[PDB]
């Protein structure tokens, strides 16, 4: 019995995680800049990375306002974003995680895209059975209206 993401929709796929990871050298991906964690008990949060300790393991934190502690989260559920603060080209791994994040790099990302999908899938998990109707009359609307537009294309 297959849940699908096409192509090649998948048998026997647990709906509580994925084996996303493809191996990469640690240094290029991340450097005490910023990252987000897919699979954590706190779910899909982003915390700027304080430092790298050993290999897979990282120390991941965030200033406040998210109930995110300074903690040891592993790269196996911690995946970089290109909204860095202190990785790569910028001269150093920075300190004062709030002030460096007071450069709105998180505030910009939290209001930019790929975070409107984080809460999208978290909205479809808190949508009670009334907004699921709202979502179905919303798709059904855009659906047939799409068909009306196709009819217009046929006319053209």
């Amino acid at each position: 019995t297959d849940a699908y993401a096409v192509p090649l929709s998948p048998l026997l796929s647990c709906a509580q995680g994925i084996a996303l990871c493809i191996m990469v050298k640690s240094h290029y991906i991340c450097a005490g800049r910023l990252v987000r964690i897919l699979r954590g008990p706190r779910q899909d949060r982003v915390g700027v990375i304080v430092d790298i300790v050993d290999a897979n393991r990282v120390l991941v934190e965030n200033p406040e306002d998210a109930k995110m502690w300074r903690h040891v989260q592993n790269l196996k559920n911690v995946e970089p974003l290109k909204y860095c603060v202190s990785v790569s080209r910028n001269c150093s791994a920075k300190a004062l995680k709030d002030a460096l994040a007071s450069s709105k790099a998180l505030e910009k990302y939290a209001k930019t895209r790929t975070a409107a999908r984080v809460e999208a899938k978290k909205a479809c998990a808190a949508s009670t059975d009334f907004e699921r109707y709202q979502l179905r009359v919303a798709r059904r609307s855009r659906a047939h209206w799409a068909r009306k537009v196709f009819d217009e294309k046929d006319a053209k």
């Binding site: 999208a120 907004e131 709202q134 919303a138 855009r142």
Partner: peptide, 27 residues
């Protein structure tokens, strides 16, 4: 693309009533 465009421009002609919840739930 006779669809992914017709379905794209299947916005902004129809009730905003429903465009808002398509946006809400990401669809």
């Amino acid at each position: 693309e006779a669809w992914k465009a017709a379905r794209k421009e299947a916005l902004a002609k129809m009730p905003k009533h429903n465009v808002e919840v398509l946006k809400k739930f990401g669809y």
